[PDB]
Amino acid sequence: DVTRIERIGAHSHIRGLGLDDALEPRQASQGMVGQLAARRAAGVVLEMIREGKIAGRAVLIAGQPGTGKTAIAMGMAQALGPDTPFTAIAGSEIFSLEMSKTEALTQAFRRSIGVRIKEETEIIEGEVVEIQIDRPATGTGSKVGKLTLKTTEMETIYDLGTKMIESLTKDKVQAGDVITIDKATGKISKLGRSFTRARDYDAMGSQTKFVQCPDGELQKRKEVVHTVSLHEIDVINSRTQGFLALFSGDTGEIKSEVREQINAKVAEWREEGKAEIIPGVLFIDEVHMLDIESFSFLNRALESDMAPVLIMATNRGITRIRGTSYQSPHGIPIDLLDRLLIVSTTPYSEKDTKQILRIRCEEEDVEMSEDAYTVLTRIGLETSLRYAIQLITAASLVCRKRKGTEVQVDDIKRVYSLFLDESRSTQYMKEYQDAFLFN
Amino acid sequence: NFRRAIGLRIKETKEVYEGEVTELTPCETENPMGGYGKTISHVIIGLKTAKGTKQLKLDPSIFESLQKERVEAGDVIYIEANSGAVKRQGRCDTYATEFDLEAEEYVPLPKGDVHKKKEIIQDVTLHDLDVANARPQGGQDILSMMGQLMKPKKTEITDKLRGEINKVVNK
């Protein structure tokens, strides 16, 4: 019924890697199938990331187009959980106008190491019974007051300080409001009006949804866990009151002196037990986009004790490294390719190509006959896997238009005639050679 | 552009009071509280429009605001019913003749009732939430006002802000 902001997309079916407790890959589990060799290796590097001991480890995932390179990266990103930072970048995204390439990579690294801070404070939480504010007839401005708070079990009176009274009066709290006061911070917050007293009221100053009175003890403790990247700690400290740059992205080329100072202070917090450092992962997809200046930065940037684990993926043969003349493996220079472990991936068979389609129809809510799967699997080897996957929704829609309730083989033959594969498109582009532009 | 092509449709009530102010009548209790000289329980404000007139009864704390704004009888004003704040619009057009020149623009008498309510459906892209959070407005501070005298420029919105907006629109 209801549609949320996240929907069905290209990799929505993957929910882990499907390894057992002995770190062996199951044939089909957690929405991944086949590809046993690379899934084992992904298990080992995931285990290394969770241990957290060793910095700057790098892994490259390689293989043909359309063989689950990105899928395995998403697989481990699910398995690693939400509580541990995992950053995705496509290699194109570092070519900023606001800052240099080495800055952009430094930010992407520092955004991938978390500092985790548990915080507890004491709060008072109650329904406001009354407020008194007394103001001088001329005087210096030394206002004074009293406030009373209620729960279903208890009520009491507070004599109010001069720094605190400005907060109540700023946020215009009044009797009948339910509020939560943080004693240490001196900040008020409001839940809403209690149901009872709004009957005994003037012409309206507010019109909003009510809330129930709090229960039991009037004073209680609260706990929050904050995860803050090293990057946002660098930004906060780059200038006074710089907070908006965490959303705005306006902070350019941060001073090295600031980061050096933060790296020290983070270590002190670790030893003090005030904060936990938690290494995460940086995933650069399509990494062959980087210039050789970017590669040369990675060589030596990867050698710091604050470096995260780095994962890269690519689909490239021996090709010329972007921004130079030189050919090399994966289009990466050997300086960097020597510093990492390569995992490689394998083309699919009938047996697993059919199984991928089966697990995809389960996610898009489709039924098909075994005859239809048989035809579609052939299409998915005559032509690429992504194309076969793309026919499944089109087949379901054409089925539904004609008031069917299960996709039949003639639905698939219909769709297959209507939307082209690249190979067929490129073939028709030969017979109209003069009519298209710039051949 | 990928965030421009996704919309929200969100719907909310507006309520407002408006009219020419005919009276301000601070109302005393029969006796003051102990030791005090006088005590005021409420203010009465009488508002009129092309449809009619009525008294509104208000909390005494309104009176400070009604002298921060230079409200005087024969002005037209409005009150935002969800917030309690009051704003002056100007002298009513009725009085435009009382001098050969005055340095104020007169405004016509409100039409319809003293108290108004409607439901409206407002529609916005996620890109509009991105920008409105990345460069705030309604400044009463050096950061805002400096930021608003300076030439505006687009900026590389961070993936954190996109994250947080996604979290709250889901709620």
């Binding site: 001088p136 007839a137 007293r197 005994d200 | 009276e23 509280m33 030791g35 005090y36």
Partner: peptide, 27 residues
């Protein structure tokens, strides 16, 4: 001597001690 503002279940109240102007003149 202090001007005093009160809000409670019985409704709101503003109060002035005797001899203070209590400057809420009518209009």
């Amino acid at each position: 001597p202090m001007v005093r503002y009160c809000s409670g279940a019985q409704g709101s109240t503003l109060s002035f001690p005797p001899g203070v102007p209590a400057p809420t003149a009518v209009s």
